[PDB]
Structure 1
Amino acid sequence: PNHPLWYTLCDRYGLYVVDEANIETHGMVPMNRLTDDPRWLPAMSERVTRMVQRDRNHPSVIIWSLGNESGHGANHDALYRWIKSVDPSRPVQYEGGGADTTATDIICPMYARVDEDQPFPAVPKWSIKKWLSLPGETRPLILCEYAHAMGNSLGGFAKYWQAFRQYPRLQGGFVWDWVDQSLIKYDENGNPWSAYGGDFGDTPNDRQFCM
């Protein structure tokens, strides 16, 4: 959840907002180790419930998200249902565990390609065009993350947009991301420069991957 003023500004200026719970457990092995654990349901519940309690009156918030990269655990399903019961006015989405689980109203993959399948075991990233028409699938598809804009990037951006316009149920997506996470440091002459991972003596670190 963002600074409270963000939602006020999005209400007044006009932007659709996905409000997302502060739950990410990416480094766990497997990713759902905590989110499938009922011992962690209380802590997870508070991060979802207290967000909804805070932000439910903002018109700009149109979709609730259960968090990010925490696999798919039974805790997600429990909390998906809690939101649907407490707030029927907004769809709930969540990408973890293969982007099309029972804890999401919207097929919301990250970096699924337009035409090319990436058939990873358990958590495949299908071509977005193919994903819509898998046997039994009826949901809209909006990528929670796509077109990773790292450095000299956004090659193939037009391919996504051609597909979005052609396919009714391809309703767009969210580019990753808005702003480089670089930090200002100063050299011997007090001149400012843009720093990334490892520039603060932080180790281990992932270098420029924050930009």
Structure 2
Amino acid sequence: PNHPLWYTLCDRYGLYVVDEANIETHGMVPMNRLTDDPRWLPAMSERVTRMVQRDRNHPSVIIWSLGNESGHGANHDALYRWIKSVDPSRPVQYEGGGADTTATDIICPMYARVDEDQPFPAVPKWSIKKWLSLPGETRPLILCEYAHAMGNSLGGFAKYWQAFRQYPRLQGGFVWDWVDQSLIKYDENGNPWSAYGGDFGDTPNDRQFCM
């Protein structure tokens, strides 16, 4: 969840918001180790329930998200249903565990490609065109993350947009991402320079991946 003013500005200027719970357990092995554990249900429930209680009156918020990169656990299903119960007015989405689990109303993959399948075990990233028509699949597809804009990037961006326009149920997505997470440091002359991971003696670090 963002600083409260953000929702007010999105209300007034006019932007659709996905409001997302402060839950990410990416570094767990496997990713759902905590989110499938009932002992972590209370801690997760608070991050979901208190977000809804704070932001449910904002018109800009049109979709609730259960968080990010935490695999798919039973705690997600419980909290998916909690939201659907207290607020039937907004769809719930969650990408973890393969982007099309029982805890999401929207197929919301990250970095799924337009035509090319990437069939990873357990959590394949199908071609988005192909994903829509998988046997039994009826849901809209909106990428929660796509077109990773790291450095000199966004090659093939037009290919997403041609597909979004041709396919009714391909309803777009959210570019990753808006702004570089670089920080300012000063050299010997007091001159500013843009710093990334590792430049603060922080170790281990992931270098320029914050940009």
**Matches of 2:134 and 2:189 in 1, distance apart?**
60
**Superimposed CA distance per residue, residues 98-141 of structure 1 (whole angstroms, 9 cap, x where no aligned partner):** 00000000000000000000000000000000000000000000
Give the match's secondary structure for 2:98.
coil
CA distance in 2, matches of 1:135, 1:12: 41
Deviations 1:159-184 (A, max 9, x none): 00000000000000000000000000
Q: How far has the Cα of 1:81 moved from its partner?
A: 0.1
Q: 1:143, 1:32 → 2: CA distance?
A: 21
Distance (Å, rounded) in 1 between the aligned partners of 2:124 and 2:110: 11
Normalised by the length of structure 1, the TM-score is 1.00
SS at match of 2:19: strand
Identity %: 100
Once the two structures are superposed, what CA deviation does each residue of 1:157-209 show, in whole Å capped at 9, x if it has no partner? 00000000000000000000000000000000000000000000000000000
Residue 172 of structure 1: SS of its match in structure 2?
A: strand
How big is the shift at 1:31?
A: 0.2
Deviation sequence 1:26-72 (CA, Å, 0-9, x none):
00000000000000000000000000000000000000000000000
C-alpha separation between the residues in 2 aligned to 1:147 and 1:207?
20
Residue 203 of structure 1 is matched in structure 2 by 203
User: d(CA) in 1 for partners of 2:161 and 2:176?
Assistant: 15
RMSD, matched Cα: 0.1
Q: How do 1:114-125 residues align onto structure 2 when only pairs under 5 Å count?
A: 114-125=114-125
Alpha-carbon separation, structure 1, partners of 2:61 and 2:112: 25
Q: Which residue of 2 aligns with 1:194?
A: 194
Q: Counterpart of 1:13? A: 13
Name structure 1 gaps, 5 residues minimum: none
Distance between the aligned counterparts of 1:198 and 1:150, measured in 2?
17
Q: Distance in 2 between matches of 1:148 and 1:207?
A: 16
Give the C-alpha shift of residue 82 in structure 1: 0.0
What 5-or-longer segments of structure 2 have no aligned partner?
none
Q: Distance in 1 between matches of 2:44 and 2:208?
A: 30
* Cα distance in structure 2, aligned partners of 1:207 and 1:132: 36
Give the distance between the partners of 1:109 and 1:15, measured in 2 at CA.
Answer: 21
Separation (CA, whole Å) in 2 of partners of 1:150 and 1:23: 24
* 3-state SS of paired residue (1:18): strand
Distance 2:157 2:203 in 1: 34
Distance in 2 between the 1:87 and 1:28 partners? 30
- Aligned residue for 1:117, secondary structure, equals coil
